[PDB]
Write an enzyme that holds these catalytic residues in place. Structure first.
Site, PDB file in Angstrom:
ATOM      1  N   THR A  21     -34.687 -28.848  -7.083  1.00  0.00           N
ATOM      2  CA  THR A  21     -34.219 -30.156  -7.461  1.00  0.00           C
ATOM      3  C   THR A  21     -34.547 -31.155  -6.381  1.00  0.00           C
ATOM      4  O   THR A  21     -34.910 -30.789  -5.261  1.00  0.00           O
ATOM      5  CB  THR A  21     -32.720 -30.175  -7.779  1.00  0.00           C
ATOM      6  OG1 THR A  21     -31.986 -29.761  -6.626  1.00  0.00           O
ATOM      7  CG2 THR A  21     -32.425 -29.249  -8.927  1.00  0.00           C
ATOM      8  N   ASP A  22     -34.551 -32.417  -6.795  1.00  0.00           N
ATOM      9  CA  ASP A  22     -34.854 -33.556  -5.926  1.00  0.00           C
ATOM     10  C   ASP A  22     -33.711 -34.597  -5.927  1.00  0.00           C
ATOM     11  O   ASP A  22     -32.686 -34.400  -6.593  1.00  0.00           O
ATOM     12  CB  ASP A  22     -36.199 -34.205  -6.344  1.00  0.00           C
ATOM     13  CG  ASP A  22     -36.143 -34.966  -7.700  1.00  0.00           C
ATOM     14  OD1 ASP A  22     -35.050 -35.284  -8.267  1.00  0.00           O
ATOM     15  OD2 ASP A  22     -37.264 -35.253  -8.203  1.00  0.00           O
ATOM     16  N   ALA A  23     -33.929 -35.711  -5.228  1.00  0.00           N
ATOM     17  CA  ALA A  23     -32.915 -36.770  -5.091  1.00  0.00           C
ATOM     18  C   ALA A  23     -32.499 -37.360  -6.423  1.00  0.00           C
ATOM     19  O   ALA A  23     -31.353 -37.758  -6.573  1.00  0.00           O
ATOM     20  CB  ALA A  23     -33.390 -37.848  -4.143  1.00  0.00           C
ATOM     21  N   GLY A  24     -33.404 -37.364  -7.404  1.00  0.00           N
ATOM     22  CA  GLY A  24     -33.083 -37.759  -8.774  1.00  0.00           C
ATOM     23  C   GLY A  24     -32.050 -36.917  -9.530  1.00  0.00           C
ATOM     24  O   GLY A  24     -31.631 -37.312 -10.616  1.00  0.00           O
TER      25      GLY A  24
END
Ligand SMILES: [Cl-]
Ligand SMILES: [Cl-]
Ligand SMILES: [Cl-]
Ligand SMILES: [Cl-]
Ligand SMILES: [Cl-]
Ligand SMILES: [Cl-]
Lengths: 141, 130, 141, 130
Positions: free
Chosen positions: D13-16
């Protein structure tokens, strides 16, 4: 401290090219990813999947990580990963984890993690819930 | 002393909006490679001398978070030089205000590049620290 | 479409063990990370660092990615990465990127990306700002 | 037809708050390895026959997002088998509701494991698809 036994929880993983380095073995940093995945799967099995955690406003945060590396794993090896709780404090937990090769059980990596329990909203320290503390040696609640 | 500067990109970040804790070990690894380069030990030198460095142990303590597009300063001090291994002490600090984000300690073994067996650190390398 | 030239923007990167695979070369997926880093650095140089983007409520989102792989890069190679804009639409942009080995300029990877411009809050499509459209061939605003 | 099931973890997963778009290519790669395994071509078979598979081209189209702890179903269809290469067509779908998240297309070359030079796909492998 925190008691372990029974049919000791192990999570099984496959090693893919993404996990390897130029040496032809698993990149050492990646064992910590495998160990993290195992803690998530242990939590799931004790009744604490991600929707349950965010439901109870719980988040687990790593404050320290230590790994000792012993023997290498190669492309397409299977790994068995433990997720034992070595000590259980009020607002934190220490995990003791072993990564073993599935074919012959040889120890590849041992890790220790100090993991803090915090409010999911505000990131402030909170007590580990009763039911969770219980789960770490046997959970009908 | 020696510090290496790095930028935090999307790939480094997690759902929390901060650097994924595992990734600090990657940044520390890059800094060790860069310290070695600056003392005359690029990769071509190592493979030239049949050297490979392997991490035998790694410890990180986490203190404060870094965010998308932060710059990081990373140290790579050599605390001890043994016969067949070296122990590093590293700090990751935010570049803007010097706040300590992570500290790491590593025992790194020297092995033969061919056979992966333990070997002595070369004289020249030991000297380059000393 | 969108015009390129001058002292053509290249970003320089070093290949570390984390980027490599069992083959002794850069893991093919990782070239897309390098190309992404180059687009961020091109934006920075045109006046659109991350604080500016969130300031203007802009976010760039990849809708498609294509890469063609040509020759391999090894541990400790340096890479030069371009970030050209091949076409500029109202609410999106197509990037055309080359990853070359620094020592001899041999082409390692070519990538094409369709990148959408959206509101940072709500993720809805928005027009690329005037100043940004301008920057993509020369920016005193 | 063949689908491989995977779990989305923090690392993906990422910051989004969603899977980092690059990571779908990793998931698709895992599925190709698993398809090969199920048709009798694990890694030990490949190195046994001096085979290595290398991606020559990769395309992904992104449609809808996946989040932390989602399960993914990933297909690995072989659209063409050429002399010295194979072309895959893949879909990543969310397990819960079958919504299409990503589609990918890959040209994969067969090379000699020793010398990295192009070689023919073995008869047995060609048959295993056919
Ligand atoms: Cl971990
Ligand atoms: Cl649950
Ligand atoms: Cl410690
Ligand atoms: Cl990209
Ligand atoms: Cl800016
Ligand atoms: Cl396409």
């Amino acid at each position: 401290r925190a008691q372990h036994g029974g049919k000791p929880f192990q999570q099984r993983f496959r090693v893919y090219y993404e996990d390897t380095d130029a040496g032809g073995i698993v990149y050492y940093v990646n064992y910590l990813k495998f160990m993290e995945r195992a803690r998530t799967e242990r939590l799931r099995a004790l009744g604490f999947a991600q929707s349950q955690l965010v439901g109870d406003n719980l988040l687990f945060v790593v404050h320290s990580a230590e790994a000792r590396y012993h023997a290498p794993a190669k492309l397409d090896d299977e790994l068995l990963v433990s997720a034992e709780v070595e000590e259980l404090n009020r607002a934190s937990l220490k995990f003791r984890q072993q990564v073993r090769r599935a074919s012959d059980s040889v120890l590849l990596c041992e890790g220790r993690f100090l993991v803090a329990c915090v409010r999911a909203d505000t990131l402030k320290p909170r007590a580990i819930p009763e039911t969770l503390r219980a789960a770490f040696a046997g959970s009908p609640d």
